[PDB]
Amino acid sequence: VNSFSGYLKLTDNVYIKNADIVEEAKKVKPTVVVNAANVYLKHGGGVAGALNKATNNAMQVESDDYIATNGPLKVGGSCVLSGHNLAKHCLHVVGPNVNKGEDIQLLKSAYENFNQHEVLLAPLLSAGIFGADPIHSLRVCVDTVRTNVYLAVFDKNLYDKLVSSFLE
Numbered sequence: 001v002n003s004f005s006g007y008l009k010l011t012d013n014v015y016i017k018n019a020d021i022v023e024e025a026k027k028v029k030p031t032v033v034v035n036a037a038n039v040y041l042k043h044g045g046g047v048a049g050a051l052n053k054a055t056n057n058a059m060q061v062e063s064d065d066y067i068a069t070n071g072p073l074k075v076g077g078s079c080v081l082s083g084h085n086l087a088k089h090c091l092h093v094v095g096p097n098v099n100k101g102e103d104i105q106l107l108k109s110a111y112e113n114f115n116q117h118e119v120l121l122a123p124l125l126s127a128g129i130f131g132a133d134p135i136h137s138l139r140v141c142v143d144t145v146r147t148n149v150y151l152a153v154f155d156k157n158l159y160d161k162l163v164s165s166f167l168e
């Protein structure tokens, strides 16, 4: 039903909230939840692990079946699969892991996938252990995504830093 609440409106189409994406998916029941995936869809930790555990491992079983038939994704690519109990669909998006030396230019390619969905609940791509500068990731989102994106950032200090930087 996409009933998002408690978000700050940064631009005409980008919103942000200090929240756990799993709890937001349970509260909002969005049409699309974005997963910060890796190319072989192994959802063991971070955001992907949090989403998979909230589906009681249904997301991992479906992803394994996808990988068996189709092989891995490319960095910057995406895949629509079921959202299980969290959303109607899960858009698995692979942003670059700059801590492992992947190309930061592909973060624009990763956000470009959001433009195929009129409204999405999403994490901040390539942040956390993927090592991208989180302020840069928020700027790429703002400049690339035209559809309505609701970013959940589960860290108060990071959220406050992103907001303060954007409002300069």
Ligand SMILES: CCNC(=O)c1cc2c(N[C@H](c3ccc4c(c3)S(=O)(=O)CCC4)C(C)C)ncnc2[nH]1
Residues within 6 Å of the ligand: 019, 020, 021, 022, 036, 045, 046, 047, 048, 050, 123, 124, 125, 126, 127, 128, 129, 130, 152, 153, 154, 155, 158
């Ligand atoms: C209690 C269960 N929930 C969680 O653990 C949880 C964690 C979490 C979250 N983490 C951010 C984040 C954003 C992007 C990426 C990562 C981490 S990663 O997994 O380190 C690598 C892939 C890219 C941090 C930057 C704050 N953002 C929103 N909702 C969340 N929920």
